[PDB]
Each structure stands twice: as structure tokens, then as C-alpha cells.
Design a protein around this ligand. Structure first.
Ligand code: NI
Length: 376
């Protein structure tokens, strides 16, 4: 029951992280608060005492009415729910703890990583097997994401590292209404550096949930995937330069109030065929949110090992997305609806300047992906 609780904690975490991640006119943001949260659950499973209480507080489980004795079981229920509701859309996740092979592991940690997180444990030799370790990890992410994410590490890791938390995830899905490839054309997209660039721009008279919010300087359109259980929610600033103010203004509560008011409507969508590929070493950003002890000397990890001084070296996150006429995949759909011109009115939603977006499960309300596009 109260499945909303971990979802709220994760979605609040999503917005905190979006507020704090590095931004520039030249840099795009793209991350899974869902996969990063599962990764912080692995840390929670292993930490005890003040190391665990510090993570508990810093992530904010108690602010969403989750007692610490209920965290692992809330992950377990969210885990079973996402991969047991049958769906046209799929998530391929690489979630694991890479631990020095010569640390003895408590069986309970193994059991919790399995049932709570569907997480793997990669025992590797971080001291002597430097290149073999990254070869193993990189092979693991490659197979877990079915060739979408193929490297977590281009170089051996520092020989000091004993525990590193990995989370890569790929979303696959098809538009409920596929765009007609014959209508895709080169169109200007105004980057955040205020130079226009020419990009493949999809065009469709497409049923979406839409509302204009001129007072908040945002137009919003929710573009559903097939099955209606997933969507891409695009927040397009009224001002060409409005993205940083919009991102600062957005909160988990406000986003929920805005999405509720969207009305089903046929709109002319202009959507660049954009591509994102991002990696984060998240330790410093997590420190800034009050998560510190899990990364420190004298971190209590008597949940993982009764016989070594473990600290988490880092939380390594990597993800990737392409937009196509069919959805996530190039030529992933072969049927199409050729729409007659409307003769009464058609709203335009033209994504031709920096914008923010969320891929959500519309039933559970989980935010799977947060995006900011400053630059194509
Ligand atoms: Ni409200």
C-alpha cells in the first residue's frame, strides 16, 4: 500500500538533482532519478547506524512518510510493480555494486540486492586486475542494456576503490501516434548560445494532452507512448531563453498540478529528432543534498561486510535517448495515419528552443527520465 510514497521521494529527488546538476548554454541534462534512487537503495541496504540515518535524511524518505524500517520493502514493491505490469514500453536496467573480490560479503546484502533492487554484484580485483575489472563491468552494462550503453569506464579505476555503485537504464517504446517520416524536414532550432542550428524536425497533427500557462511562461504537451502507460511531457518556455527560469521555478508539487490540468487536444507538434548521451559521477551532487557518510572514512557498512572498512567511491550513472518518428528506435513502426488539414483551428507546439521534458509512467506517476535540451 502507499506506493505513492517512494514515487514522491524519487520525484522530489528528481527535481532537487535537476536544480543542482551543472548547466551551460552548450550542455544538455539527461538522467534517471529512478535508476539513481535504486542505486542509493543499494547503499541504504549496506549502511548501518549514523551512516544509514544520514542517507535516510539526505535523500528525504522521511519527508515522504517512509520509516527507515520500510525503505527496502518500498523498493521491493516498486521493483515488482514496474516489471510485472505488462507494457508495450520496456526498461533495460544495469544496476549493480562493483565490490573488491577479496571483501567477504554478508549473504543478507546479496538477498536484499536481489529482492529489493534486481541488482547484480560484480566482485572484481580493483588492486591488481585494473583493466580486467572495467572489461567485466563494461561487458556487463553492454549485455544488461542490450547494446544501448556499452562503457561505464574508459580507463582502469584508481586502485584505492573498493565499492562503486553503477546504474544505467534504457527506455524502449513506440509513439501511440507515429510521426509520418515524409513530413520530417530540416528546421532551425535556436540553441541556448542564441545561434540557430538546422535539425531533422518531425511534424504531426497529433492528439496529446496540452495546456498553455502564459502566467508561468510555459506551454506543456504530453506525448503518449503506445499503451498510454508512458508519456514524454515537454515543458516549452514561452520565452526563447526561458529554460533556466522555468527549471528553477518547477517543483515536484507544481509539475503534478500542471500535468493534471492538461486537456486532450489535436495540436501541430514540431519535434526535433534529438539525441542525448550523458554520464555522471554523482558523489559531489549527492553530498550537496546531505548524503555524505556513505562516501566517508569510518562509514558503517557492517550490512555488506563484517571484516573491512568500506566506503562508496561514487555513484556512476549513464543513459542515452534518441527521438524518431516511431518512438525510441529508428524505424520502429511501419503503419501511420495521414491526417487531413483541420479547417477550424490547430494549436502549434513548436519545440525550436531550449526545453525541459520528463518521461513518466502515467499510472504510477514515477518520473523515469528528466531532460533539459539547451543545444542540438
Ligand atoms: Ni497544489
Amino acid at each position: 500500500l502507499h506506493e505513492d510514497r517512494l514515487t514522491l521521494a524519487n520525484n522530489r529527488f528528481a527535481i532537487s538533482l535537476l536544480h543542482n546538476l551543472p548547466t551551460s548554454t552548450e550542455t544538455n541534462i539527461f538522467f534517471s532519478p529512478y535508476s539513481i534512487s535504486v542505486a542509493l537503495g543499494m547503499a541504504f541496504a549496506g549502511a548501518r547506524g549514523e551512516t544509514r540515518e544520514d542517507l535516510f535524511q539526505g535523500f528525504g524518505y522521511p519527508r515522504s512518510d517512509i520509516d527507515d524500517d520500510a525503505v527496502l520493502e518500498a523498493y521491493a514493491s516498486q521493483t515488482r510493480r514496474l516489471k510485472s505490469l505488462r507494457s508495450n514500453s520496456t526498461l533495460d536496467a544495469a544496476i549493480g555494486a562493483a565490490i573488491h573480490e577479496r571483501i567477504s560479503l554478508l549473504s543478507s546484502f546479496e538477498d536484499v540486492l536481489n529482492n529489493s533492487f534486481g541488482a547484480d554484484i560484480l566482485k572484481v580485483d580493483f588492486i591488481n586486475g585494473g583493466q580486467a575489472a572495467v572489461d567485466v563491468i563494461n561487458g556487463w552494462v553492454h549485455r544488461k542494456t542490450r547494446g544501448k550503453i556499452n562503457l561505464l569506464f574508459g580507463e582502469p579505476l584508481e586502485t584505492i576503490i573498493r565499492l562503486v555503485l553503477l546504474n544505467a537504464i534504457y527506455f524502449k517504446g513506440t509513439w501511440d501516434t507515429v510521426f509520418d517520416q515524409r513530413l520530417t524536414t530540416k528546421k532551425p532550432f535556436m540553441n541556448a548560445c542564441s545561434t540557430p542550428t538546422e535539425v531533422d524536425t518531425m511534424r504531426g497533427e497529433v492528439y496529446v494532452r496540452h495546456k498553455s500557462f502564459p502566467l508561468l511562461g510555459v506551454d506543456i504537451a504530453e506525448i503518449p507512448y503506445r499503451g498510454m502507460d508512458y508519456s514524454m511531457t515537454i515543458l516549452l518556455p514561452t520565452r526563447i531563453d526561458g529554460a533556466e527560469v522555468l527549471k528553477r521555478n518547477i517543483t515536484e508539487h507544481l509539475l503534478q498540478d500542471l500535468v493534471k490540468q492538461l486537456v486532450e487536444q489535436q495540436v501541430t507538434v514540431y519535434l526535433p529528432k534529438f539525441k542525448l548521451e550523458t554520464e555522471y559521477l554523482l558523489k559531489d551532487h549527492l553530498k550537496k543534498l546531505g548524503i555524505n557518510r556513505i562516501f566517508g572514512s569510518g562509514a558503517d557498512f557492517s550490512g555488506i561486510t563484517h571484516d573491512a572498512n568500506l566506503a562508496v567511491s561514487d555513484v556512476v550513472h549513464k543513459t542515452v535517448l534518441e527521438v524518431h518518428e516511431a518512438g525510441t528506435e529508428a524505424a520502429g513502426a511501419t503503419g501511420v495515419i495521414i491526417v487531413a488539414e483541420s479547417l477550424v483551428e490547430s494549436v502549434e507546439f513548436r519545440v525550436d528552443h531550449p526545453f525541459i521534458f520528463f518521461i513518466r509512467n502515467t499510472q504510477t506517476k514515477d518520473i523515469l527520465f528528466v531532460g533539459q535540451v539547451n543545444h542540438l
